[model samples]
Target: GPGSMENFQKVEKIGEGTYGVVYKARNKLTGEVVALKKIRLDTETEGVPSTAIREISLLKELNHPNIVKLLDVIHTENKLYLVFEFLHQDLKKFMDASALTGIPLPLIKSYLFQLLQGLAFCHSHRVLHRDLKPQNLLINTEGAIKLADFGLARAFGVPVRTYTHEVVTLWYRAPEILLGCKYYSTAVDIWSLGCIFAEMVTRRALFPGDSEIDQLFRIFRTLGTPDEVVWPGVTSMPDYKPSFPKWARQDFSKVVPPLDEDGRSLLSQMLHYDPNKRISAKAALAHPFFQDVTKP
Candidate 1:
């Protein structure tokens, strides 16, 4: 019974996202608190889903403080369990609770810093977290954020190949992906982080779109429509259209009112239209916006 579900007792159901049903469980032997993602097996003889397999394999190679710790994988005749270190809440819920006053400035810096650290580690390991929304970020009482939900992640090394653009949530999806570019990289995650960073300051979605086309319009309205001048070769993309509206780029201050100049600068770099020009997670950690922020 090395990896047996019987070792843990489910305390309560905490989440039931696209992946599976998650429970806040307690280890019977060590009495440790853990989150268990129970993957149901349609038939006892069949194997686990491809999503779970990818998540388990990718998480097994990643080790970082800001990344969710995959402690163990428990298997049963009828189910598969992924054991993770339990966190109190997700960033989405935390932001919802902080709607009254918004997240503190320094706290926002800390949270974003931690997120970048986890993302930097993942990118360094050649992993791309295709889906990176606030709901996928877990938080503890101490304000530390851990990147979770690797269901859409992939390990892409040099010479990347085309993949489906049907990843990432509508609001957090990158411009290139929304425009039908499948040859994406870690910059996609950077774009999501930029949206999340602004959301922390404003306590609402930076770009809330009802569909893919609407999402592109939301981004265009906020950042201005991209063209060959702004994003070289933009016209060559599969979804590029001359009929798209031409919008003027709004100032960052007008977009996210509370962020300071330095923070706005970092956000701008992260949201660059050209993925090649977007700020890397490691580079972002050294930006002036976080110069005064001390790592804990």
Candidate 2:
């Protein structure tokens, strides 16, 4: 135990993950409602857990409106706690609430733009949010999206460091990473952004693939298989292999029929076959798709 444990009175269980239990709590000193993420360390070494330390250290230095703030850290025997500003719900909940119901086009654009803004900031700071999904994006009553869950995030510019290929949720994983490209960049995040964008527009996932090969097939079916000419180093990737029934590139117009010109353009930019050619997060923030967005 390091800090005073008397400040927090758990109100309710908010969420549970592989690492910890999140609870809604009220800070006694400031009387402000906050989220207390108590991490279980039963299987971890003594003192503070490594995952908790990584998240706390990174969040402490990362200050941006789009990214969640780590207000404080409290340690108790057998547990490590992270305190974050309270939020009403996450993007997943918001989407579920609006499921089968039409959300205004402007609102959808605003959310996607905000999500990109957060990713841009993270990328600028050399942080790759290895896992980018709706469930990890917390939204407040003011309708601002704050990127959360830095547990899988890490500084990505380090040279020659071997990354665990086993990052990212399957649905949000980039095609290159799925093909076992070890030397990836922030474009991985862009691909996930494309998936989120598609989900926002259609109110459902574009390619809900169940397995690695299935995911590649789903992507190939929509974007078409990448030839060695288009993606030069692809064939050399660890998991690269020829897929069956090679299909030609399909018109994006047909793939995302409902998306307006601007929407489709932005989606295509994010989901490019070559990771190097994918639009940068900063450029994405300036895309015409978000021209009329009012909220940051």
Candidate 3:
């Protein structure tokens, strides 16, 4: 049964924002640690937020070691509570540990491999996470990575109408998304995964943009502007323009020196200009770059 608030004790407030407040809690009977996320019910209509509903429904069906587990769900008068396995640190904080010394290469490969496995599972299930970023990736004491924050996630491939283009963060946003692509697919997550992979290597974001246009330019300057030859349907994008600045592709080895030939090759495939041409999570899991990666 989904327990009530009385079943646990809130130890401390760990997270909070426009979404809701998250608290570290202890189950009274089992003494197990958990994260209790309290979703505030909108007072106006007294209806459950669609984000919470989406998160709960999607998370209920997703079962993987690399995906955050939803332990329980509780509903009360004014608040809805979601119980999750508590992971003390997020990738953002993990990556912030001594920027001078970036994450170890072996650990980078391990985390990236685990991330791909999790994403592959989601993609196989026909779901698109929609948002993939450092902060949403949780890390445990064992160094295992778990995908979190499914509020923006949804199942794909139903011939749905255009979705809001205002998804994903500016820095990790895919070129298609930045160029006003509404019918984005699983490739968008692949783009963010590529950004995370490089960030794990360089200890800094590859594309740090302040605006949508800025993001596009940053990507273009590094990956080169997408012409008809590079991306067959690039010109058909809603925001496509003939007057856009032309920037030749730069070298990934120069931008991310720590990456080897195979790593850079995988990065290029993940960052391909055409979303359809981007590497799938399943295919990326088998890339040679992960051949030597240590398994859990």
Stretches > 4 Å off in candidate 2: 1-3, 42-48, 158-160
Winner on lDDT between 2 and 3 is 3
The Cα local distance difference test for each model comes to 0.89, 0.84, 0.88
Q: Give the lDDT of residue 6 in candidate 3.
A: 87
lDDT of 2 by residue, 109-134 (tens): 88888888888998888888889898
Ranking of predictions according to TM-score: 3, 1, 2
Model 1 vs. true fold: TM: 0.96
CA RMSD of all predictions: 1.6, 2.0, 1.4
Best prediction by lDDT = 1
Candidate 1 lDDT, tens digit per residue, 35-92?
9998888652447777888899999999999999999987776778899999989989
Tens digits of per-residue lDDT for model 3, 180-242: 866888889999999999999887898999988888998899989999998988888899888
* Model 1 lDDT at residue 156: 91
> Candidate 2 — what's its lDDT?
0.84
Clashing pairs in 2: none
Q: Of the pair 1 and 2, which is ahead by lDDT?
A: 1
Name the candidate, 1 or 2, with the larger TM-score value: 1
